[PDB]
Ligand binder design. Structure first.
Ligand SMILES: Nc1nc2c(ncn2[C@@H]2O[C@H](COP(=O)(O)OP(=O)(O)O)[C@@H](O)[C@H]2O)c(=O)[nH]1
Ligand SMILES: [Mn+2]
Ligand SMILES: [Mn+2]
Ligand code: NA
Length: 605
């Protein structure tokens, strides 16, 4: 009985299964205190002041209630190589690659995991508070929501989870005796410290391990206090566990922004889009459209949970409550809506601080007044001449979603928004035109599966889900393809975009950002069934003169929309080899058929 150690809440008022979870882990981890989070303002404010008291965070004096955490430089990112999924059979988690190295997941056996777990968690919270975070992924009480309980020894996790999910007493009330996902986290530095603390940032890099056990509905994460490793909604629950539930239950859990776009006629449609990190989800979800009379509103910028309703509409929710955005490259010029969102009640991690207590980072494109100086994320004086960036490249803002000036009115509607188009895209400097439309659902799924993006080399990132599949990618393709056999299903039109095509000198061919409204306008019209497409071997592209290019006189249209037989032969052979090596016996017939159909179309150029 751990009652004597509860410093907020009551073990007696927790649902029986929740209590079991907490007490079992209190006995294992040996926390000094147990704090059952209520999610209140008062709780939050004091937690912040305490972290400030301890030097774990700094208040940024230039803003209303903004904070800065600077990490141990060993703990700056989600770490794929220490991220695993446990299942009885390896093939259920990942396909077996012919090369002996899967790019599509990282399986761990139950046996190896039990040894790892036992080498880490016993006594790991000694002399710390175990916080109990009851959270909802999705609007509270939504039929599409799922509930988690995170145990953590990190107040930084609590504060960030209050932003990134819906947490507190109301969730425990909603939960009752329902099922929930068990989320267990420790920074893995029990007191007294065995190793020196760096930058007031508790972590255990050598023992970092982020595990998922979908068959037990557990997420178990050790040694990192950072982002996707420690905020267990966000990638572990909302993509990895959730994609497996989705497969079981007949829905989709995806790495997609969700936006609502209204045309000048006042007609509105929702679109979802899957792009990998650094390929523009935040920019698109919060776009300030350049086209007069168009409006974009943000439902979410990262995760979409989608389920066909009784009427066959594909209904999407954003299961998050906030934006955990990469800060560098965010500028007033490029992304004014994100700039407005983050000016209050935001936690920043590993950005630079100006001497007047403000935030700074690469690509902020805000000149500073003469005399204003910069402290880098490594707590050193820094000047724009310097070899190193002032902010870590993976540094973040963590901001409440409700503060986005263009947040959609239906962003928390419990039944979700009806999705009429799904967009795929990444960074392709060559070959791939600005926009194309898939010929069918099956072709659209192949376009998803074929996605590549230049991020530290050109690499495959199918559906923008490479680091996030909860189970075998081949089976995930079959799941997508199965949506076509749902009677009365209204399947979204699928498009592929490329904002990032360059000429031989390395110059972007398309201005992008707000100008992408011109491409959305074409998509909108296409969903309306307008005759604005020309057929090409890779799918439909805009007709000559179909795009509104008024205001953009010097756009190399020939190169931006060019399709080269030579490029596309190479592209299909590379896709064929990748699918063969990485997916093989688990590749659905229809994906193989689409690949052969594409090859044939190109052969006839
Ligand atoms: N050239 C160009 N860059 C873009 C565009 N959209 C976003 N970016 C840049 O890509 C980087 C990451 O963008 P962001 O929207 O944060 O991407 P996310 O990581 O997918 O959410 C930033 O430097 C952006 O300024 C675009 O349409 N064109
Ligand atoms: Mn993401
Ligand atoms: Mn983002
Ligand atoms: Na710090």
């Amino acid at each position: 009985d751990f009652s004597a150690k509860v410093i907020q809440g009551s073990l007696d008022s927790l649902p029986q299964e929740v209590r079991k979870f907490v007490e079992g882990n209190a006995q294992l981890c040996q926390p000094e205190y147990i704090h059952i989070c209520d999610g209140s303002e008062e709780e939050y404010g004091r937690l912040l002041a305490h972290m400030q008291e301890e030097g774990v965070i700094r208040k940024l004096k230039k803003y209303d209630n903004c904070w800065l955490a600077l990490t141990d430089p060993r703990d700056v990112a989600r770490i794929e190589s220490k991220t695993v999924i446990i299942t009885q059979e390896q093939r259920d988690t990942v396909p077996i690659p012919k090369s002996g190295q899967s790019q599509l997941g990282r399986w761990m056996s139950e046996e190896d995991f039990e040894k790892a777990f036992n080498a880490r968690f016993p006594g790991c919270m000694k002399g710390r508070t175990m916080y109990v975070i009851p959270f909802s992924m999705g609007p509270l009480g939504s039929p599409l929501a799922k509930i988690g309980i995170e145990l953590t020894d990190s107040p930084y996790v609590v504060a960030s989870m209050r932003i990134m999910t819906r947490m507190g007493t109301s969730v425990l009330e909603a939960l009752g005796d329902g099922e929930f996902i068990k989320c267990l986290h420790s920074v893995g530095c029990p007191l007294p410290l065995k190793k020196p603390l760096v930058n007031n940032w508790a972590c255990n890099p050598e023992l970092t391990l982020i595990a998922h056990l979908p068959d037990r509905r557990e997420i178990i994460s050790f040694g990192s206090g950072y982002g996707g490793n420690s905020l267990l909604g966000k990638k572990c629950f909302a993509l990895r566990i959730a994609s497996r539930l989705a497969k079981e239950e007949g829905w989709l859990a995806e790495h997609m922004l969700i936006l609502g776009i209204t045309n000048p006629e006042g007609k509105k449609k929702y679109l979802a889009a899957a792009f990998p990190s650094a390929c523009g989800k935040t920019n698109l979800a919060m776009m300030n459209p350049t086209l007069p009379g168009w409006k974009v509103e943000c439902v979410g910028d990262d995760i979409a949970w989608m389920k066909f309703d009784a009427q066959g509409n594909l209904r999407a929710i954003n299961p998050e409550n906030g934006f955990f955005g990469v800060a560098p490259g965010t500028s007033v010029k490029t992304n004014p809506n994100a700039i407005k969102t983050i000016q209050k009640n935001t936690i920043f991690t590993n950005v630079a601080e100006t001497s007047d207590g403000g935030v700074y980072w690469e690509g902020i494109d805000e000149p500073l007044a003469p005399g204003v100086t910069i402290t880098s994320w490594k707590n050193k004086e820094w000047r724009p001449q310097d070899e190193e960036p002032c902010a870590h490249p993976n540094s973040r803002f963590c901001t409440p979603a409700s503060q986005c000036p263009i947040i959609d009115p239906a962003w928390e509607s419990p039944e979700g928004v009806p999705i009429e188009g799904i967009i795929f895209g990444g960074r392709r400097p060559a070959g791939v035109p600005l926009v194309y439309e898939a010929l069918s659902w099956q072709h659209g799924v192949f376009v998803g599966a074929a996605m590549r993006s230049e991020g530290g080399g050109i690499m495959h990132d199918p559906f923008a889900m490479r680091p996030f599949f909860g189970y075998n990618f081949g089976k995930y393709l079959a799941h997508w393809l199965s949506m076509a056999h749902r009677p009365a299903a209204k399947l979204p039109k699928i498009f592929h975009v490329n904002w990032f095509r360059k000429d031989k000198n390395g110059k972007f061919l398309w201005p992008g950002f707000g100008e992408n409204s011109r491409v959305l306008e074409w998509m909108f019209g296409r969903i309306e069934g307008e005759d604005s497409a020309k057929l090409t071997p890779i799918g439909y592209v805009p007709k000559e003169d179909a795009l509104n290019l008024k205001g953009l006189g010097d756009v190399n249209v020939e190169e931006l929309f060019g399709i080269s037989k030579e490029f596309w032969e190479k592209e299909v052979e590379e896709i064929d080899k990748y699918l063969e090596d990485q997916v093989n016996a688990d590749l659905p017939y229809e994906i193989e058929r689409e690949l052969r159909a594409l090859k044939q179309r190109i052969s006839q150029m």
